[PDB]
Coordinates of C-alpha atoms in Angstrom, one line a residue:
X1 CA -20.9 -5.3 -17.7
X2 CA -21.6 -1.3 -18.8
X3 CA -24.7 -0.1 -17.6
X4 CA -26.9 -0.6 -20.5
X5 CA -25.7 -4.4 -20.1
X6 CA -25.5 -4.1 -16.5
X7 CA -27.6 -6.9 -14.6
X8 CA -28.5 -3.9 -11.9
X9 CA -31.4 -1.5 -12.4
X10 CA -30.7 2.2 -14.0
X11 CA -29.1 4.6 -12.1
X12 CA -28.4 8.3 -12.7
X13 CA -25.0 9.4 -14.1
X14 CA -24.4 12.8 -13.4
X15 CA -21.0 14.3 -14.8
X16 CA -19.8 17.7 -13.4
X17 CA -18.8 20.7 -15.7
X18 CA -16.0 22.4 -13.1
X19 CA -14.5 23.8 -16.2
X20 CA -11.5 22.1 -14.2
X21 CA -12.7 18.8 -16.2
X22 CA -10.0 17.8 -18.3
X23 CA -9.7 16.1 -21.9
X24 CA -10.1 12.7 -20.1
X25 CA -13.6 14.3 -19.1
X26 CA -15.4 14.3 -22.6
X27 CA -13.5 11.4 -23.7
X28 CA -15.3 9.5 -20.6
X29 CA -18.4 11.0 -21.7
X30 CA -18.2 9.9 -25.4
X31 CA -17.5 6.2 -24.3
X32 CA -20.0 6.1 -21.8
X33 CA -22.9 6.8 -24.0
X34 CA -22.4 3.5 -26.1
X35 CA -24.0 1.9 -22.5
X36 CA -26.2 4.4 -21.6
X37 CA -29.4 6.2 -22.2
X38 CA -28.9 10.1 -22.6
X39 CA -32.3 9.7 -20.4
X40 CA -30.3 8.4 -17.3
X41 CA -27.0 10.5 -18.4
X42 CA -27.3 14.3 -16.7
X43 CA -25.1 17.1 -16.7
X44 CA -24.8 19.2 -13.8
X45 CA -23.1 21.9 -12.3
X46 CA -21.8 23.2 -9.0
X47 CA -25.1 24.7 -8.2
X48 CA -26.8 22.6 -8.9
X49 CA -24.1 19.7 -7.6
X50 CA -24.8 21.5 -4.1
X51 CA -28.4 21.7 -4.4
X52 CA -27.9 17.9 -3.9
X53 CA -28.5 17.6 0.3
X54 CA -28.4 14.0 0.1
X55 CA -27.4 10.3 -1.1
X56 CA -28.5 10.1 -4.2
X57 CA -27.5 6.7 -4.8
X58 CA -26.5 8.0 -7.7
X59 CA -22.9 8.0 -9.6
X60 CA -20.7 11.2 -9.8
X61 CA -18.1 12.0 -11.8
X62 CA -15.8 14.5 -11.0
X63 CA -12.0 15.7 -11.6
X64 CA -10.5 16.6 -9.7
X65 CA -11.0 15.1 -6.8
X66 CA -11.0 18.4 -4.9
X67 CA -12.8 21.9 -4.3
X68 CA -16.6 22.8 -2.9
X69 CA -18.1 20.3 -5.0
X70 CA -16.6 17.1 -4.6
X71 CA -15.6 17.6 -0.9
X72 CA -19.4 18.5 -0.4
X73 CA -20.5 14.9 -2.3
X74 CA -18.4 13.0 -0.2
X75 CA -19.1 14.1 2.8
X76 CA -22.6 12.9 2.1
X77 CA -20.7 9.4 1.0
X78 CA -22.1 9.3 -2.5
X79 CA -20.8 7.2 -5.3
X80 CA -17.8 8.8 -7.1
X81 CA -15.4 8.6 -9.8
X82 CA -12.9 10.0 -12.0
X83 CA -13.6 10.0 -15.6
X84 CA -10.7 7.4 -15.7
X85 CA -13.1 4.9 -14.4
X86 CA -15.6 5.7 -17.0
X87 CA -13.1 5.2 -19.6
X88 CA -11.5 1.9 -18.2
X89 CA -15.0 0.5 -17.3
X90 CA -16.2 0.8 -21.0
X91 CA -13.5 0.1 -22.4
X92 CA -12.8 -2.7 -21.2
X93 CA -16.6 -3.8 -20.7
X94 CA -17.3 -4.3 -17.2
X95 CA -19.7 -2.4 -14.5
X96 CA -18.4 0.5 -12.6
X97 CA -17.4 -0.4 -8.7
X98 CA -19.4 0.1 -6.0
X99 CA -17.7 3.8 -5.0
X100 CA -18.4 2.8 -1.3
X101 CA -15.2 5.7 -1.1
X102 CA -14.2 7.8 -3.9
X103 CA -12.5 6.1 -7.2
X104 CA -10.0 8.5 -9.2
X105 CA -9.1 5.5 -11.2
X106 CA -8.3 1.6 -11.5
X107 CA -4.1 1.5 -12.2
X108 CA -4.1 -0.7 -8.9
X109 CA -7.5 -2.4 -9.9
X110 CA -6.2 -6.1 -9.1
X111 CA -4.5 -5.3 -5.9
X112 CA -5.4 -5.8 -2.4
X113 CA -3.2 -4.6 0.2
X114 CA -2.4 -4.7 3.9
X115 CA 0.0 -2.8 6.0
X116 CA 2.4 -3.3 8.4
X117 CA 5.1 -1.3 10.6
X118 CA 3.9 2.0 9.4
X119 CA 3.7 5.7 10.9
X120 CA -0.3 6.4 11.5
X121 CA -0.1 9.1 9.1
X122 CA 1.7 6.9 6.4
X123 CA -0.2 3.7 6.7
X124 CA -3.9 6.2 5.9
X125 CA -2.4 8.0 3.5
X126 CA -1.5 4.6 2.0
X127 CA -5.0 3.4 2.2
X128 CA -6.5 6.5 0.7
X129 CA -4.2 6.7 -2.5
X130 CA -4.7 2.3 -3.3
X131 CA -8.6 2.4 -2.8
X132 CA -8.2 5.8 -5.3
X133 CA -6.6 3.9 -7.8
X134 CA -8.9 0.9 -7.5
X135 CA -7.4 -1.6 -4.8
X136 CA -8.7 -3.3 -2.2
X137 CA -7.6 -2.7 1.8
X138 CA -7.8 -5.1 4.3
X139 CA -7.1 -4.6 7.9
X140 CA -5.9 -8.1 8.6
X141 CA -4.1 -10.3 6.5
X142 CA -5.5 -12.8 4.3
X143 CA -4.8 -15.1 1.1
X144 CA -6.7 -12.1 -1.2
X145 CA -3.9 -10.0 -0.2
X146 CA -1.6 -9.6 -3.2
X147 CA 1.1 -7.2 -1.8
X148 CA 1.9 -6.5 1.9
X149 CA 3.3 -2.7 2.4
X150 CA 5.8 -2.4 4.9
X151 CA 8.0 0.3 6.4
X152 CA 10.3 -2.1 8.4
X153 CA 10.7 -6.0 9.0
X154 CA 9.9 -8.1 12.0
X155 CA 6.4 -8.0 12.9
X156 CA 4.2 -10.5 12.8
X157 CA 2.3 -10.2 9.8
X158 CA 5.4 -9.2 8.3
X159 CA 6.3 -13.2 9.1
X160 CA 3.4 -14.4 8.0
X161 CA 3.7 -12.3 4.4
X162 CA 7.0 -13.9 4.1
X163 CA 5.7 -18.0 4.6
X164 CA 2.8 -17.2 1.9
X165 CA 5.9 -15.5 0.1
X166 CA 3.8 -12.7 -0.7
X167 CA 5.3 -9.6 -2.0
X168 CA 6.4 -7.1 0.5
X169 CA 7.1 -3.6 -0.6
X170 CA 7.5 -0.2 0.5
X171 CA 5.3 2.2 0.9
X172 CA 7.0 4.2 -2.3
X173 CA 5.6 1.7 -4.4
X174 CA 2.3 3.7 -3.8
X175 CA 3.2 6.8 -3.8
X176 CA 5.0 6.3 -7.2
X177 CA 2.1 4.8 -8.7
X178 CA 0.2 7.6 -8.1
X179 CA 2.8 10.3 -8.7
X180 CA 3.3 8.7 -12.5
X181 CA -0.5 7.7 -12.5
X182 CA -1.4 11.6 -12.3
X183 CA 1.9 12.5 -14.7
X184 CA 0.2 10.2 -16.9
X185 CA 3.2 7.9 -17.5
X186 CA 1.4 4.8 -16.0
X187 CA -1.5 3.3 -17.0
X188 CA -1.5 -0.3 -15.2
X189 CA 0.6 -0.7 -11.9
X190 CA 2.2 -3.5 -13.5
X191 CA 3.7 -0.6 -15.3
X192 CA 6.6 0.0 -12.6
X193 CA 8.9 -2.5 -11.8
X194 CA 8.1 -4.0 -8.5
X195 CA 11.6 -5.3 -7.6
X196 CA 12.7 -1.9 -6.9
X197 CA 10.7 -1.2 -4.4
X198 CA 11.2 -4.5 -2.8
X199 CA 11.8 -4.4 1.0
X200 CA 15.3 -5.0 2.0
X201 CA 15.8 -8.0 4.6
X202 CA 16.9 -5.7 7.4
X203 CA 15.2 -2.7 6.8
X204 CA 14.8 -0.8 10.2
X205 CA 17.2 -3.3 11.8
X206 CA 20.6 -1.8 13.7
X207 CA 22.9 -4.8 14.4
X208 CA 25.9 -5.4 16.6
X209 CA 28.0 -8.2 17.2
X210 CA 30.1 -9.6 19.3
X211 CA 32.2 -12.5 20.6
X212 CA 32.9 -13.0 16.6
X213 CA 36.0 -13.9 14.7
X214 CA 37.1 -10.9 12.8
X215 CA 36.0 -12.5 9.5
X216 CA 32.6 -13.2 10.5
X217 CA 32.1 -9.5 12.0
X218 CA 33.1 -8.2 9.0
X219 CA 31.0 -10.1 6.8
X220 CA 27.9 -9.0 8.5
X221 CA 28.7 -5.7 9.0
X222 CA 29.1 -6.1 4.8
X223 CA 25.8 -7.7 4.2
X224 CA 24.2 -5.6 7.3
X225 CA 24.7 -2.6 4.9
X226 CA 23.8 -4.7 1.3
X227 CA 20.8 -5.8 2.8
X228 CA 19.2 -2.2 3.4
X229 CA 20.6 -2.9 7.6
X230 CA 22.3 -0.2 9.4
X231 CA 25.8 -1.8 11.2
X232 CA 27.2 0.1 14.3
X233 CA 30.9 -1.1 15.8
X234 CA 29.5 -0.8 19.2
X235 CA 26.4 -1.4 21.5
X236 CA 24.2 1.4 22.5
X237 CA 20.8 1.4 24.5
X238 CA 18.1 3.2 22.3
X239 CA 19.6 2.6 19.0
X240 CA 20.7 -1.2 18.6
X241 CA 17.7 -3.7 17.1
X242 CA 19.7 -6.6 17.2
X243 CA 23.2 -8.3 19.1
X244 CA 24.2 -11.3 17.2
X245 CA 26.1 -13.0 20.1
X246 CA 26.4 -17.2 20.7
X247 CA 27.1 -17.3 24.4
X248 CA 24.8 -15.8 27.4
X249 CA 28.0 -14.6 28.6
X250 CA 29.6 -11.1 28.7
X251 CA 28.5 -7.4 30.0
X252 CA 27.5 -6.5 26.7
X253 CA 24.9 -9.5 26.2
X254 CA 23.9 -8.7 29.9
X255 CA 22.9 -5.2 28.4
X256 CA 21.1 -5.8 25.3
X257 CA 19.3 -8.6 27.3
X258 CA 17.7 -5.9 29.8
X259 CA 17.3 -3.7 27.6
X260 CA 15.1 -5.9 25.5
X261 CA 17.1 -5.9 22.4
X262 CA 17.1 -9.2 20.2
X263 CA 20.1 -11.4 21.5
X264 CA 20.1 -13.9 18.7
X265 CA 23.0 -16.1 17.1
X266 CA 24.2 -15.8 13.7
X267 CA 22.1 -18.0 12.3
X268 CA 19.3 -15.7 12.8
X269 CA 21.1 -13.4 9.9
X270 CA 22.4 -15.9 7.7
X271 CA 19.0 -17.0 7.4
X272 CA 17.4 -14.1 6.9
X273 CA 19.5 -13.7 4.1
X274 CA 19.0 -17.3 3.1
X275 CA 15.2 -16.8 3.3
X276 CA 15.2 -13.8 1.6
X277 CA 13.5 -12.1 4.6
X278 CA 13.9 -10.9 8.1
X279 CA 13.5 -14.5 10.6
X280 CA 11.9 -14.7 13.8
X281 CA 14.1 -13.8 16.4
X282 CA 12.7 -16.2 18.8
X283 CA 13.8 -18.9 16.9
X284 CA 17.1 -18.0 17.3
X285 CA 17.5 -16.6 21.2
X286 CA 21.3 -16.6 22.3
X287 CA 19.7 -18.2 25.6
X288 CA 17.3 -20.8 24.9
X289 CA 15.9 -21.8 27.5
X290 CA 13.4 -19.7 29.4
X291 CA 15.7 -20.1 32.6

């Protein structure tokens, strides 16, 4: 585990005295110390922090995880950690991780994520705050995945998620983890409740009807709107997702059709709500056949 007990050779921990380092700091350093050799445990500065022009393969402690010192550190790619890490690590009696990027903490320490459906922006600054707070990231999905983020339904990993019934949440679920992690109200992501940050079934989804009983219209434009959809009255180009319609028949299906909007049937939407996520459309094509 801890580095006196670790099955890897001594390494140099050097803890930085920013004067910016917080109570958590000397608590990290009085825990550490029951694993580790004063000999191998340095204290440095920002002078001499800088003095440091390459990878010293050794591991830094720093909070925060900002200013001349830390940016300069990891810019080099250097092992780093919050003093959170420290604390959790002995505590709980197990080796540091590899910093192959910067680790403010482990609140997301058993998670591994993978995105899906998100802005370019969103989806790095999603990667950035999970592997701060301990978690895993992986590109593709896989069965180590514990949580898929997502920022609408429908795509294919999305689908795929949703057959492994693997939990799919938005990208909120992060950013509050990390907003109560810094607050200091969380300690463990299992602190939050998960459920409310739940993807709804048709987020991102605009849905039209017709050719349907008024009953049936209504009801879907209900559930449309209970299941986080947006339900418009009429069909227009550049804003509908989806035209639940039964027939290949009518100038509005003719419409949706060229315009590459989803022409499904209702069954496509009753089973989304069935299944508890968004369906594949293809399954469900209004016209069937390929012609």
């Amino acid at each position: 585990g801890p580095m006196s007990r670790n099955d890897k050779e001594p390494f140099f921990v050097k803890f930085l005295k920013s004067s910016d380092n917080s109570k958590c700091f000397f608590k990290a350093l009085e825990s550490i110390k029951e694993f580790q050799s004063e000999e191998y445990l340095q204290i440095i500065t920002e002078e001499e922090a800088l003095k440091i022009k390459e990878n010293d393969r050794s591991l830094y402690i720093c909070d925060p995880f900002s200013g001349v010192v830390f940016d300069h550190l990891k810019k080099l790619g250097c092992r780093i950690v919050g003093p959170q890490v420290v604390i959790f690590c002995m505590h709980h009696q197990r080796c540091v991780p590899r910093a192959e990027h910067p680790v403010y903490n482990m609140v997301m320490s058993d998670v591994t994520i993978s995105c899906t459906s998100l802005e370019k922006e969103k989806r790095e600054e999603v990667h950035k705050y999970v592997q701060m707070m301990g978690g895993r990231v992986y590109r593709d999905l896989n069965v180590s995945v514990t949580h898929l983020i997502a920022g609408e339904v429908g795509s294919k990993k999305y689908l795929v998620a949703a057959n492994l019934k693997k939990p799919i949440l938005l990208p909120s679920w992060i950013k509050t983890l990390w907003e109560k992690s810094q607050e200091k109200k969380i300690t463990r992501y299992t602190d939050i409740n998960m459920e409310d940050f739940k993807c709804p079934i048709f987020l991102g989804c605009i849905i039209c009807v017709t050719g349907l009983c008024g009953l049936d219209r209504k009801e879907v434009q209900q559930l449309t709107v209970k299941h986080g959809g947006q339900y418009m009255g009429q069909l227009k180009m550049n804003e509908c997702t989806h035209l639940i319609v039964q027939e290949p028949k009518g100038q509005k299906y003719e419409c949706a059709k060229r315009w590459n909007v989803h022409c499904v049937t209702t069954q496509w939407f009753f089973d989304s709500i069935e299944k508890g996520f968004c369906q594949d459309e293809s399954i469900y094509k209004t016209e069937p056949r390929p012609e």
